[PDB]
Design an enzyme around this catalytic site. Structure first.
Site, PDB file in Angstrom:
ATOM      1  N   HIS A  42       3.050  -0.578   2.430  1.00 22.03           N
ATOM      2  CA  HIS A  42       1.814   0.072   1.970  1.00 22.03           C
ATOM      3  C   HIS A  42       0.345   0.072   2.348  1.00 22.03           C
ATOM      4  O   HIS A  42      -0.425   0.648   1.796  1.00 22.03           O
ATOM      5  CB  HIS A  42       1.762  -0.183   0.282  1.00 22.03           C
ATOM      6  CG  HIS A  42       2.918   0.318  -0.475  1.00 22.03           C
ATOM      7  ND1 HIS A  42       3.393   1.499  -0.633  1.00 22.03           N
ATOM      8  CD2 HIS A  42       4.176  -0.784  -0.792  1.00 22.03           C
ATOM      9  CE1 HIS A  42       4.513   1.273  -1.314  1.00 22.03           C
ATOM     10  NE2 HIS A  42       4.948   0.216  -1.308  1.00 22.03           N
ATOM     11  N   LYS A  68      13.305   6.372   3.228  1.00 14.17           N
ATOM     12  CA  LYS A  68      12.853   5.766   1.925  1.00 14.17           C
ATOM     13  C   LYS A  68      12.233   7.371   1.704  1.00 14.17           C
ATOM     14  O   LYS A  68      11.657   8.075   2.460  1.00 14.17           O
ATOM     15  CB  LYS A  68      11.894   4.930   2.171  1.00 14.17           C
ATOM     16  CG  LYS A  68      11.085   4.597   1.056  1.00 14.17           C
ATOM     17  CD  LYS A  68      10.421   3.386   0.984  1.00 14.17           C
ATOM     18  CE  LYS A  68       9.990   3.031  -0.412  1.00 14.17           C
ATOM     19  NZ  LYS A  68       8.644   2.760  -0.733  1.00 14.17           N
ATOM     20  N   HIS A  86       4.093  -4.228  -5.548  1.00  7.78           N
ATOM     21  CA  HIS A  86       4.562  -2.920  -5.495  1.00  7.78           C
ATOM     22  C   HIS A  86       3.508  -1.718  -5.796  1.00  7.78           C
ATOM     23  O   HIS A  86       2.414  -2.184  -6.254  1.00  7.78           O
ATOM     24  CB  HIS A  86       5.575  -2.758  -6.636  1.00  7.78           C
ATOM     25  CG  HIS A  86       6.760  -3.727  -6.825  1.00  7.78           C
ATOM     26  ND1 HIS A  86       7.927  -3.703  -5.915  1.00  7.78           N
ATOM     27  CD2 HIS A  86       7.213  -4.755  -7.774  1.00  7.78           C
ATOM     28  CE1 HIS A  86       8.624  -4.903  -6.114  1.00  7.78           C
ATOM     29  NE2 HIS A  86       8.418  -5.092  -7.200  1.00  7.78           N
ATOM     30  N   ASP A 112       2.763   1.546  -7.561  1.00 10.59           N
ATOM     31  CA  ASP A 112       3.276   1.891  -8.685  1.00 10.59           C
ATOM     32  C   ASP A 112       3.240   3.393  -8.423  1.00 10.59           C
ATOM     33  O   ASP A 112       4.098   4.297  -9.045  1.00 10.59           O
ATOM     34  CB  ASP A 112       3.057   1.343  -9.989  1.00 10.59           C
ATOM     35  CG  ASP A 112       4.244   1.592 -11.031  1.00 10.59           C
ATOM     36  OD1 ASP A 112       5.255   1.452 -10.834  1.00 10.59           O
ATOM     37  OD2 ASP A 112       3.783   2.058 -12.142  1.00 10.59           O
TER      38      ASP A 112
END
Length: 124
Positions: A12, A41, A119, A121
């Site tokens: 990310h 993905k 993560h 979100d």
């Protein structure tokens, strides 16, 4: 071996480019970052801010995570991001993606000590 924090950085973070370099960006980056290794993905977001800026989101606005956990944090500032979404015509192993640059608040889940992003979100 790879920490959850490292995996967040791999999946990310892209501080090298201040915006979505090009129309090719997602195609290149989803591959380079090993997000097309096992499957395509299907959606993934890259952040174009310093690591320290993204990390600091963990002490920013506490919001509900999409799974109902309470460890999600929304950035008070907008951040440069690129969303990568799989084209309809995309076929593994040649994963193909639409590259969309945006400036939005990011929402990340944080965990651990130190308390860091694990993560991505959502963005809003």
């Amino acid at each position: 071996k790879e920490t959850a924090a490292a995996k967040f950085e791999r999946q990310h973070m892209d501080s090298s480019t201040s915006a979505a370099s090009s129309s090719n960006y997602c195609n290149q980056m989803m591959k380079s970052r090993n997000l097309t290794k096992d499957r395509c993905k299907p959606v993934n977001t890259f952040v174009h801010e310093s690591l320290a800026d993204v990390q600091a989101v963990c002490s920013q606005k506490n919001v509900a995570c999409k799974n109902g956990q309470t460890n999600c944090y929304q950035s008070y500032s907008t951040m440069s991001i690129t969303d990568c979404r799989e084209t309809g015509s995309s076929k593994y192993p040649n994963c193909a993606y639409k590259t969309t640059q945006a400036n939005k608040h990011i929402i990340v889940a944080c965990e651990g000590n130190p308390y860091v992003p694990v993560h991505f979100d959502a963005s809003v």
